[model samples]
Target chain A: VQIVYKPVDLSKVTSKCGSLGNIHHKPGGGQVEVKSEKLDFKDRVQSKIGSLDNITHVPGGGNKKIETHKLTFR
Target chain B: VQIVYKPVDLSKVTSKCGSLGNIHHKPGGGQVEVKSEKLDFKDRVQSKIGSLDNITHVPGGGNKKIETHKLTFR
Candidate 1:
């Protein structure tokens, strides 16, 4: 008799990263929101979520780019 | 008494959508994860995240399509 372990599905692994960058403009501009999610092995879950501050716009147009950091899981 | 109102920043509103689509293949396949995050009013956090099952192939390649529901805030 031979015993073998089930193989892991690498393709099933999915990862997502989201961030709220730059919102500084005029009379309105402040905080930002960021979040992410990933699925690894069975019965296991991985996610990243957080927020940023001091968001502002450039001298031209569009919101300014804010540096985002990876949040730890609770 | 005077009532004052502040305008909402439409441009500041950031919406994100993520999905894991198609992974059907021999020797590997199954399950998918999806997630999204959005920033609305101050002190208010909104997020959408979920997962799906029964993923299969399309006779060619890629993982099957799975429906994802919006997640509510706690």
Candidate 2:
């Protein structure tokens, strides 16, 4: 698949490969905050929770902190 | 994140929520063949590797087989 581009703002990302291609845009220094789940890709931009697919926080929309520095997926 | 779905053909899927929502399609009982990675979403539709985001198979396009059934992401 092909990846569309942009500048920084995002630090980490994980994704699965399927039949078509998908693109992700995180333009705010995409900081990774803590919560629960395998990879904490949920709370970088908390206020944008709904914008982040309703997965913007933990099960209860909890508080979190930073983890990684730059993750990418294709 | 909101997940778009179709009938079956896909068995498992894993993804992280970012700014925009992503969609995946595995219309052949999306089998989970093996390789090595955090989640095994690669080998399912092997022959469609390139179409699956260059992540269609293992690092070397290795061999894999059915491992799970009916999986989803929300």
Candidate 3:
């Protein structure tokens, strides 16, 4: 039973064949949570090149980034 | 009150700004059904251009067509 803080770069996750996963690793209960370096509740995830409920574009769509959102008038 | 078979080309529907509709029309409660001119129970319909709940591609994904499907191959 041991632990290591070896996190990964999610911005370069094309080698993985488009599967969704939790940030927590479990080599007997390990984890790797993705957090925003800036935003509090949103992580700037970058994933493109396609598959499994993925969104792809030609250098747009914020390059697989997550911005806030549009507002509606009340 | 009159009825005439004035079927329009479904393959040229871009100026309509991407909407979905049944083949039935109602100038005064009228309808039009799509049917295959060759096959007995299948219809050869063609529609391209962007839309709501639509699938767009460079020249693939069957250009928006529907075919039969199933499961439980046991």
- lDDT per residue for candidate 1 within A3-67, as digits (tens), equals 22222222232212222232222221222243434422333334322221222222222222222
Candidate that would win on lDDT: 2
lDDT of 3: 0.23
Decoy 2 TM-score against native = 0.12
Clashing pairs in 1: A24-A56, B22-B63, B23-B63, B24-B63
| DockQ category of candidate 1 | incorrect
Q: List native contact recovery per candidate, as a fraction of 1.
A: 0.01, 0.04, 0.00
Q: lDDT for model 2, on a 0 to 1 scale?
A: 0.28
Which tens-of-lDDT digit does each residue in A25-73 have in candidate 3?
A: 2111222222223222233333311111322222211112222222222
Instruction: Please give the DockQ score of every candidate, comma-separated.
Output: 0.02, 0.03, 0.01
- The digit string of per-residue lDDT tens for model 2 on B1-74 reads 23222223323223422223444333222222223234222222323221122222223212222322233322
Q: B1-74, model 1: which lDDT tens digit per residue?
A: 22222222222222222222323233112232434344223343333222212322222211222222222222
For candidate 2, the docking band is incorrect
Which of the CAPRI classes, incorrect, acceptable, medium or high, describes model 3?
A: incorrect
Off by over 4 Å in 1: A9-19, A28-74, B1-74
Which of candidates 1 and 2 is the stronger one according to lDDT?
2
- Kindly list the per-residue Cα lDDT of model 2 for residues A1-74, writing each as its tens digit: 33333223332223432232454433222233323333323222222211122122212212222222232332
